[model samples]
Target: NSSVRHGLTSAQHEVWLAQQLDPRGAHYRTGSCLEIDGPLDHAVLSRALRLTVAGTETLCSRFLTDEEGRPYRAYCPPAPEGSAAVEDPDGVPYTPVLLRHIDLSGHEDPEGEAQRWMDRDRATPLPLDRPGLSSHALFTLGGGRHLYYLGVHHIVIDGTSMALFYERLAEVYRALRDGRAVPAAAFGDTDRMVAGEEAYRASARYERDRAYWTGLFTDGGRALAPTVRSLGLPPERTEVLGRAAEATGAHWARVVIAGVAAFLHRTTGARDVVVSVPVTGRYGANARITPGMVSNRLPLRLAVRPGESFARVVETVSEAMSGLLAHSRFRGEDLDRELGGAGVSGPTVNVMPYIRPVDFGGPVGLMRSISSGPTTDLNIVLTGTPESGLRVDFEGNPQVYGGQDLTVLQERFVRFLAELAADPAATVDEVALLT
Candidate 1:
């Protein structure tokens, strides 16, 4: 009998190799917790999760190294007894779905207890060698309320894929409630997706992409001076960046990129700024439906002209981003190697407009959703929220930036965007920095 082994995509391989280098790092795992303030049908939830695990191919995939030390993703067929939900009397082992009953009836600190449960679950890691790389738990908080916690490996799903997973789960749960037929899986197979990477690398477009980036980085020995290390500041801060962007009549993505470039310009006095942005690489419907890591990071170089109006800066950013997206198929590491390993240092601005409120159909109302994972030196995130117009997070390594420095940077960024929104026609020279 022939053995089944699927090659890992370039993106998947990058993450796998990183994990190998840093075995204990949580960088490859993404954790999320969903708060529930209403009743939950445990039986229906169990079946929905089981069907979800069986339908999503990437969820059932495991990583294995061949004799040549090449990592490949192997799919584990779902067993007839593969019900994702499990209840344990001693303790919950790693399962796709775990149900625990914590009767907090008349308890004074029920919320605190639930939070502790969530904290413990968040620290738990889902091994890559396991069949199901996703884990979820339901904690009963009496008075007809519950808490749902989810953690998944980034290799199987990125932020976009996680959103899709929740959407599909909600749809499936609703269909079951309505006594309708369960929907067929709409995602593409991981093997097919991984196989396409070879075709991409062999294409002429890949060479063109390489040439463009190589030329851009030919003289790229310049680097940003290190900021004060170990900024004893909180991990993140939030703001209303979206409302300000809407007032300026520009896309939030363009506005944020311009704001970052402007910030670097003021700090470094560099007319040209370069940074990386992660984009969802799932363009086609088939790819979009698939639950796997399809996101790619591409370099974005912004040319800040002297006396440039904020409007003009945003215009340039828009064009550059469009072009980058058009040619975002190539690997970033390959491009870096092409650039002679001369690395460019700067903060990455990631705009996630797709993260908003999700309706998970039923009496189990979602109270709040929070996600946490590894980060780089500086990670500026602009996420869409249901209650707030936008949630902005300015995150950096504590060793690189002191708490006060990040706080100042975050405040300045907010004011900078506010100023641009207040006067879209203001030139760089016209605007004054906040004291």
Candidate 2:
């Protein structure tokens, strides 16, 4: 009851409203399952988890509703009385994080049993009204093998934060094994991030950013054609696209965006198409290190002008991408609310071009989960690196596109990529969409 509280940022407030609307939905839950091979010390790991959670702002944060209908977050760092049991060394008295341990090492089939538990845990939703917005579980598989599953509500954390979480926790676990005054695992200051956000919100840049995006759908973007493919190609063909993508100096990711914009323009005959890309709102070292809900799904406006070559399209997307990353902090929910429902249009290109490997002492196998809120738009998430065979996961909202429709779209998208890579100089009209 005794703590300093602050109002939710506009981005987080939207998450609050969504969770209130659908309390049982797992759509906002995100998780990561890691298979670790190490001579792990459970106590050291547990201590590391506690210290890290206490240090990360949102992990230890609590959300509550007042009679005024005000929802704010509170973080308490004090433990009262002779409660040595209540608080850890850093004076962080408590966290809403749920700690669980399941011993499936004795199960007849440990791996299968572990998967079943992980699946069950993922489908289950975290309580919103309470302080705990995260769950951490360590499952034993025997033979120095263990599975660590970390699940966090979107409002409290994100996909990007998971890696940092692992990195920091592992950092602490190592230090503990050596032991010191033990500098706690601390995330960058939230004050600077909040300051930047507040300043931006109060500036003309916010208006300009909002206008830049809203203007693209001046006609409400009533029709955003829903739209990937296997990249299995002859080695030489794959090399050509790789070389072409490298020739532009633009990340291969931007090349794919260029390709996506071209596909929409070619198929739907739309002059301009906006694709939604997920942006981590962290602008500096601080926000990048701090795990919070500063991330947003902003519409990236791209124009495939008449007879624009795939090369030019890449430049267009690259320049446009640079343009939007500055305005990434703008709340998409607020922007959408302003333009009416029709304004929020575009295929989502959730590109995760290989995150730096998260190490937990030894070889750690990690995978992410994102059950983001509902949407009717087409979803295209490209993950993996070129070296490891890039993946383009494409799907349409079931309500909008059916099973057979997705299969055809996926095939065509793959073909489109092949053609784009094979000939970056090809104009929109020159490229063939023969799947």
Candidate 3:
């Protein structure tokens, strides 16, 4: 193997490297679960372990070095043997629990397993007192480890990271188990190249967030149009429906969310309202080879103006996509500071729009499996394998929006998108609801 350098300035390289060096970066927030359904085998599983470590090592190697090029390294402190502990930065006491295992091979019903394991009183998908990690358990021959990683927040990682991490693990595992000397998907570090972009490091977007946040809070929080009844619920339902819903690409989804934001702006008079969404940072040049947390939360502000059609508002989103991508790192917190505050609760639109195209080495005997995760406290995720029609996963805080309010909003979103996807030129107000 040869160490090759990407064409990047030293500063740009360091920015990305810092992220890769994150020892606990995998300790992400949110009760998100991902799975690879394959026939269970000891050799396959053992190979998987090797790949997981190597994948992590490869990813960490990219960012471990500081600006001085000093490699960063932090070994996870030992817990009682055979147990995983989630901890605070100072290595202070956090949540410590031994992994739990359950047997489900005899049960023919996945529904029964869900009902037993994931429930309100049971080990439901609620956040542990300390932030939780990706949990895996064995059902029959297949088992999982709750990756008790540290650092990194939910705002940073997304579904793409989940898939990439697993795919690479599988790739390496298959090669090693089959006695191959090298991996099939070998690629160089990518984030090292992306951080080199001068535009990414600039702080111009912070000013925009400042202006936007200031306007959003000028009338106090009430004017921000809180959804009165959305109790963020764990996604407890699934169905293939036999037919795919109309597939609206990312561009169309943006147009619809922007249109909804415009309708909100016109009805509420919130001048600096924003429609934010989570985007996978896999669109740039380094995507093919680089593996890192490139996920960014993007906010599209619909500045209220006289007589803006919902369609025209949607069009504004189409025009704004390029600009938003250029300034993707302008996080919610950053925008809040620019707006002179800690944060603001407005409509943040995030969707994980990925459709699995091929069997990226599914787990052994994983015939028909549906993956799931806990929804956010106050966000709507446009989730689907694309075109299968999007299911709106709405998670609202109990103090903010209740279940009824969330239901209405969820229905309104699905119906609105269905209508729009069916007819993009339809009047925005025709399908939207004002909170």
Candidate 4:
């Protein structure tokens, strides 16, 4: 056990450092809920959650500072086979998973009540030094229906992995219900991943990535002007969004990134554009399947001239983002630390078009990201498939913007997206974002 401790991954270290400044741990929380209407299996559901959490090492990782007062992580063994939650003597960050099964079936509208419950509960600040990094709750809606809310501190997971957790939970649940042993999760070894990253940080590729970011951004530079989609989008709008992506050859997220650039240009009239886009940080197959905090945000700069058409800008951004993909492993935190916060500017555009609405042997509602901690600048978080249409949410720094600011910005941005789909050829001067 003495030899089991290790340093956090680059991505995990960034989140752990963020938590020091934010004691409440509000800014980095990420979670989603599922509305399931099917033949229920409470016992299997609980077992599935436990096994899934236990299988993933990061979920059980405990955060503690060494004697020199430097933070490091160590994994706790999985929760014992049991019905009740396990709490260690010197508490780890959380149990493998804590299932809170509540009977809200008596309420006149159990679903409505559960929604309110989620809102209040999610807002509660997480004491990361304490327990419950991963928390699960199932609300009984009567008649075998249920609402499952799975919450976790972003210190442990990323957007992509959260969707992955859903897939795993569902897989285990179905297998057990059909009378089978829990599948041997082909999850990669956590220590092996840690060592791989260590090697990467020391390799020529890491040096190249660092050099690329260093050349792209310099310290003492001006980074400001922040302001900030949904699955509710109609079919045709999705078609055009897709059409622009295909024609430009940038893929879906880049298409949406172009829209944000247009929004910034329209609102501020700035020819120089820069926004943050989060990289998966799962560069290898191991990290891809292993659940851990490995997402990095990098600043994306675009040059949009008034004379150029929207189609041209999207093409340029697509090519630019594609190029940056190779250099994204460079930690945004490291960039900020040395280069004076050049890594992330205002207005982060995160388009999660890969995470689609899923079915786990029953209907599952859209997996929504409830809280994205610390909105110091405008953030556009979009998740949905082209088939299901896109859903968008606009969040602003509470210290800077107000309700009307975000509301007006949202209206104009939606209009701009419509125009983006309707007429990608519309020049910057011609595009009608009728204010």
Instruction: Please tell me which predicted candidate would have the highest TM-score against the true structure.
Output: 4
Worst 10 residues of 2 by lDDT: 222-231
TM-score of each: 0.80, 0.79, 0.59, 0.88
Compose the digit string of candidate 3's lDDT tens values, residues 164-267: 55556556656656677646455445435355333544656546744544554565221111222222222222211111112323355665566557556655
lDDT of 1 by residue, 1-435 (tens): 014787777778877876776665555565444456667677787778767777877877777788998888777655434554454575323334343445665787776776666545544666676667766777676877777666677777776777677667767878898899988868776666665667778889888877777776777232111222111112122234455466656676777788778777877779778878887776555666778887777878888875888878888788888878777887776776555544555677777655444555645433232332344467676555322445455555555666577778877776776676556578876677775
Model 1, residue 263: what's the lDDT? 71
Give the clash count for each candidate: 7, 2, 28, 11
For model 2 the TM-score comes to 0.79
What tens-digit string does per-residue lDDT give for candidate 4 at 132-232? 47777888898777778877777787777788888888888777877888788877765677788888899999999989888887632322222221224
**Superposition error at 219 for model 2 (Å):** 3.1
lDDT of each: 0.65, 0.69, 0.43, 0.71
* Pairs in steric clash, model 2: 27-371, 96-132
TM-score preference between candidates 1 and 4, better one: 4
The TM-score between candidate 1 and the true structure equals 0.80
- Cα displacement (angstroms), candidate 2, residue 340, comes to 0.8
Question: Candidates sorted by TM-score, descending order?
Answer: 4, 1, 2, 3
**Model 2 misplaced stretches (Cα beyond 4 Å):** 35-43, 76-119, 138-147, 178-183, 220-242, 266-269, 305-308, 366-374, 388-398, 401-419, 427-435
